[PDB]
Design a binder for this molecule. Structure first.
Ligand SMILES: C[C@H](Nc1cc(Cl)nc2c1cnn2[C@@H]1O[C@H](COP(=O)(O)CP(=O)(O)O)[C@@H](O)[C@H]1O)c1ccc(F)cc1
Ligand SMILES: C[C@H](Nc1cc(Cl)nc2c1cnn2[C@@H]1O[C@H](COP(=O)(O)CP(=O)(O)O)[C@@H](O)[C@H]1O)c1ccc(F)cc1
Ligand SMILES: [Ca+2]
Ligand SMILES: [Ca+2]
Ligand SMILES: [Zn+2]
Ligand SMILES: [Zn+2]
Ligand SMILES: [Zn+2]
Ligand SMILES: [Zn+2]
Lengths: 514, 514
């Protein structure tokens, strides 16, 4: 018995087709993804194969002006039009609190929404009961397939789930659910969740009875053969994990932003044992036509959003590189721009720090340089604030050591800077990688760069996320000796662009490698 | 017979008292120089000593809004009110052409104006004849003192004297004039001129019959004992030169901007032999009251100039360091500001170069940060343009080698930069001091810094002065493969400040030393 798993993850409000970098579609002929193109490819596989499952591994919420305006009603609507079979809860599903998950998605979806490790407590327990499930048994032709859900335990440190939700360890919470399915004679079991590739592999290893792991969160790209685009594979597709009980468990993910549609074909026997598995993510490029019916509906919903592109806030003559392969690895000019908007809005305060992972999209300069509220909404979607903090030289030094402590894994904590010249030597031990740290003086008439002093105290502009110890920056949370709340992150960057009129941020050497 | 020489040089339109850096007087209680304070000290010496000469060694023209508006009529007026005895022609006396020297100064001055090495030719010869003199014999009590003038041969490469004026070698032109004075039994001879301290010393050495050299042009500060201000002495006051014929010849200069009044007391015998000489420049600080009559007249002339301070073009929250001790020696933030105003006005063009000597004044931030047309007029008084040029990598490399070829002598050619990261190793041979030269790419979507290539061609924004080979930049003149004239230098910097509203240029590491 053959099963075709079609899967998406970390779509992040990219309901419309995008450029290859996942920012707004400028050159339509080379545009990718979007739900209309996705609907065409799904329909094609559904005609060709009898046993198909369309699954989402979370983080449909947050990313573009679609979520800013419709707040998830678009997620429920277009995921229903595409006829998704199940969806696991992601951390961005809690960005608008539990209320913002319950009303526009949980109550509106025509498919089960899953998470076995999210437990409700207090006054919320009665309210959210039944709206999401730990598992769902789905009929697939003449057979039955069990789907178990999970969500990152990191969700309270990344989102706004509130005080009445407990995030248990995935493996601990999944084993009694899979055991329960085995007792009901459900011999075909999919773990569908949002915890990242490292967790996906451990679930595949330790959770007895799991046949396949369909994951997300870490935007992992997997491929067998020669990849079709810019994305570099982190492993073969599917990634094989040998479970503690000796089974070959396929582990899958399909990058992010709806650029690819994951496609895994599984061969099961009568007892639900995985005989074989093969496939690859399918690049949703312009070679696949967008569905005309879906595009017509997308275009109807577009009318309300056209108000966030009406006004040209300013222009860029440079590509604004806000991509994760740049901003989580090195100095990126989008990071320089935002840190310059931060320092300018507060002018003394000479220094700025900014987690690269907080930068959610690039902006393309080819559309006559035009920067709109919509272009900016994709770069900064969280609605955070840029705060003023006072830090010891030693604290700021520990933050920069933390910035590169696990360098190479595309992690969010890598800092973008303003009024700071940092030099890292990656060849050294984590916690001893900063080889130079020069800072811009405030207590001077002519601002110039001087070596940071451990026994000195500096005023840093940073997002509230970092001021509250986000991205594992516990030293900032624990050691800050002053914290003032500032202006809204999007309004800070918008006013600066308006004042500058024409912008051209460069990669200047604020961050260097030895 | 005792003679007191009171001398000024390179006053540069600083008719009003200034701050200690020579920019506009903000804090009146610690303000210096100006003609009113100078008049008080001169009057004091004139009461104390019977044989006094008040001399000017040139460059009264150019420097502040006083010259911009009155075009030299203020020079003639206040130099007459101070009762100057003689003045040697400087190169800035030719900034407004020969017409701009003849009409507001030559025809209006109540004292001889001298230069023995400036020779008139063509249609101008008949026009300028007698308006300036090669020498002047002046009665000083019961004795007679001969004063010979000279001007820098560099004047045609620094100013606008035109095609009908020949600048001969000073020593060649001075010897027949001094010889002529010796035949008329003038045994006391002063050489008063504008060629710089190195030339002043050679005239003292080689021109037989010269008793004293009163110079200018190089803003040389000389002192005996402990100096009273920021100015570092380049030698003792007077500087003694032993002439080829064995005489001890005192050589004097009194810095610039009317901050100091040079004071040299000479002891002559009956045959005009210099027995002894002593003195020092007198710091014209607030301890010397300004003359009330002169200040009243200065205040009358001020009314017309108050129109150039009426409008606040923008604000600075940083001291704008446009001083020669910074801009001719290292990266200065005034240079960064002007190079940023240049790149911004032309936006691809990523690179800017700017001779430090072209920056004529700092701007102080303490007057509520206020930048006016008057503040800017002192920084950029020449009315030049910022031009676009196309240069080979090899040409730009030779220009940067030329920038530091004679480093240490406060020379004008030291370049301020935009979109360029240069590293100099001064320990190396002149012409091989550039150890790193990184440039900002134009042919890229994300501008970043890359090592300059000799076989590449770049678009540089620079003042017309450098495009025409000024400051010995013959390689730019001879090798530029494109030259387009740009916008007026003051209007470029003014528009940028207006657009930015609040400015804070830093010393960023654009220029470094190894
Ligand atoms: C509480 C949260 N605050 C944030 C602010 C900022 Cl400035 N950055 C953030 C977060 C959260 N994550 N991040 C970065 O995103 C990275 C993770 O991104 P990914 O690897 O792509 C995997 P996900 O798609 O689940 O974020 C972190 O490492 C962080 O660098 C927030 C608040 C309000 C909202 F409406 C939405 C979210
Ligand atoms: C033809 C001249 N162009 C100039 C433009 C610029 Cl951008 N800079 C310049 C000059 C001349 N000199 N300089 C710098 O001044 C330095 C010399 O200054 P000082 O040592 O102080 C001794 P002086 O007071 O006689 O200038 C030179 O080395 C140069 O760096 C010009 C044109 C129009 C005018 F209304 C006035 C002058
Ligand atoms: Ca099974
Ligand atoms: Ca003599
Ligand atoms: Zn995600
Ligand atoms: Zn996630
Ligand atoms: Zn001068
Ligand atoms: Zn001069």
């Amino acid at each position: 018995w053959e099963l075709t798993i079609l899967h998406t993850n970390d779509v992040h409000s990219r309901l419309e087709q995008t450029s290859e970098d996942s920012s707004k579609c400028v050159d339509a002929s080379r545009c990718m993804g979007g739900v209309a193109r996705l609907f065409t490819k799904v329909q094609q596989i559904r005609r060709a194969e009898p046993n198909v499952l369309l699954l989402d591994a979370g983080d449909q919420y947050q990313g573009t002006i679609w979520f800013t305006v419709y707040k998830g009603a678009e997620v429920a609507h277009f995921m229903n039009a595409l006829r998704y079979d199940a969806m696991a809860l992601g951390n961005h599903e809690f960005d608008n609190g539990v209320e913002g998950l319950i009303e526009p998605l949980l109550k509106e979806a025509k498919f089960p929404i899953l998470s076995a490790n999210i437990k409700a407590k207090g006054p919320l327990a009665s309210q959210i009961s039944g709206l999401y499930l730990p598992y769902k048994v789905l009929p697939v032709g003449d057979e039955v397939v069990g789907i178990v859900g999970y969500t990152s335990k990191e969700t309270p440190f990344l989102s706004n789930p509130g005080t009445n939700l407990v995030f248990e360890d995935e493996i601990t919470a999944l084993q009694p659910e899979v055991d329960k399915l085995k007792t009901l004679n459900v011999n075909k079991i999919i773990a569908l969740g949002h915890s990242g590739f490292e967790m996906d592999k451990l679930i595949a290893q330790k959770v007895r009875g799991v046949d396949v792991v369909v994951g997300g969160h870490s935007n992992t790209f997997l491929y067998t053969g020669n990849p079709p685009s810019k994305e570099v594979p982190a492993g073969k597709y599917p990634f094989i994990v040998t479970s503690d009980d000796g089974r070959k468990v396929p582990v899958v993910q399909a990058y992010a932003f709806g650029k690819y549609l994951g496609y895994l074909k599984i061969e099961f026997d009568e007892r639900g044992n995985v005989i074989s598995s093969h496939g690859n993510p399918i690049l949703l490029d312009s070679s696949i036509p967008e569905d005309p019916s879906i595009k017509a509906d997308i275009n109807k919903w577009r009318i309300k959003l056209d108000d966030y592109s009406t006004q040209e806030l300013g222009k860029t003559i440079v590509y604004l590189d806000g991509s994760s392969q740049s901003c989580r690895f090195r100095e990126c000019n989008m990071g320089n721009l935002i840190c310059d908007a931060m320092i300018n809005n507060n002018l003394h305060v000479s220094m700025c720090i900014l987690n690269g992972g907080g930068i959610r999209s690039p902006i393309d300069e080819r559309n006559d340089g035009t920067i709109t509220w919509e272009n900016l909404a994709a770069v900064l979607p969280f609605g955070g604030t840029f705060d003023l903090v006072q830090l010891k030289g030693s604290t700021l030094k520990k933050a920069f050591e933390h910035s590169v402590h696990r360098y190479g894994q595309s992690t969010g904590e890598f800092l973008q800077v303003g009024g700071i010249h940092v030099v890292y030597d990656l060849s050294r031990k984590p916690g001893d990688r900063v080889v130079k740290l020069d800072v811009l003086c405030t207590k001077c008439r002519v601002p110039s760069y001087d070596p940071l002093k451990m026994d000195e105290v500096y005023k840093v502009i940073l997002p509230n996320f970092l001021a509250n110890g986000g991205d594992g920056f516990q030293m900032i949370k624990d050691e800050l000796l002053r914290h003032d709340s500032g202006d809204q992150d999007i309004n800070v960057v918008s006013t600066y662009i308006s004042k500058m009129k024409v912008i051209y941020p460069a990669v200047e050497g604020r961050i260097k490698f030895s």
